[PDB]
Amino acid sequence: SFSGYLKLTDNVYIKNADIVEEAKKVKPTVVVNAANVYLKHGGGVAGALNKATNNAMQVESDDYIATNGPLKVGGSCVLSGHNLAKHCLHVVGPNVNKGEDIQLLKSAYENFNQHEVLLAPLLSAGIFGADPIHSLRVCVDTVRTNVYLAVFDKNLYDKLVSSFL
């Protein structure tokens, strides 16, 4: 039921869309969150997804952290998708603004391979500070399952499509 996506490869699709609106429309089995190790969904994609859940994502996340401790950079956990999806896969890409190793972006994308189909943002893009062109490249070269990428910014979406090798 994903509609309006441009096909980049055999398994990677892209659309200029607000991932919250896309999740509400599609109700995918998995929506990926651009999480941090503490699951503190303050801003960027995480802040927007959490706000769409009326903070239920944050309440669930705080209980998860209280039980399990923080995630690793490059790691993930599966939690509820609330009103957005069946599940939310919280994936921690490296935050270059915190000096985290950009080489961990491939490990972060490997989490997507545990799910046959996902709605996702570009990991480490936006407020995480990585080059979104590089994130898309790592995505296509790492993810083998079906990934539907939602890119919020039209100007960035156009740049990503027009520069895609």
Ligand X SMILES: C[C@H]1CNC[C@H](CO)C1
Q: Residue numbers of the site for ligand X (CB under 6 A)?
A: 1, 26-29
Q: Residue of minimal CB distance from ligand X?
A: 1
In the bound state with ligand X, the residue whose beta carbon lies nearer, of 81 and 93, is: 81
Q: How far is the CB of 85 from ligand X (least distance, A)?
A: 8
Q: How far is it, in rounded angstroms, from Cα 14 to Cα 23?
A: 14
Least distance (Å) from ligand X to the CB of residue 92?
25
The pairing of strands 12-16 and 6-7 is antiparallel
Q: With CA atoms as reference, report the closest residue to 109 among 72, 148, 135.
A: 135
The letter for the amino acid at 44 is G
Q: Among residues 85 and 105, whose Cβ is nearest to ligand X?
A: 85
- Residue 41 or 115: the one with the smaller Cβ distance to ligand X is 115
| CA–CA distance, 38 with 35 (Å, rounded to integer) | 8
**Taking the complex as a whole, how short is the minimal distance between the CB of residue 39 and ligand X, in angstroms?**
24
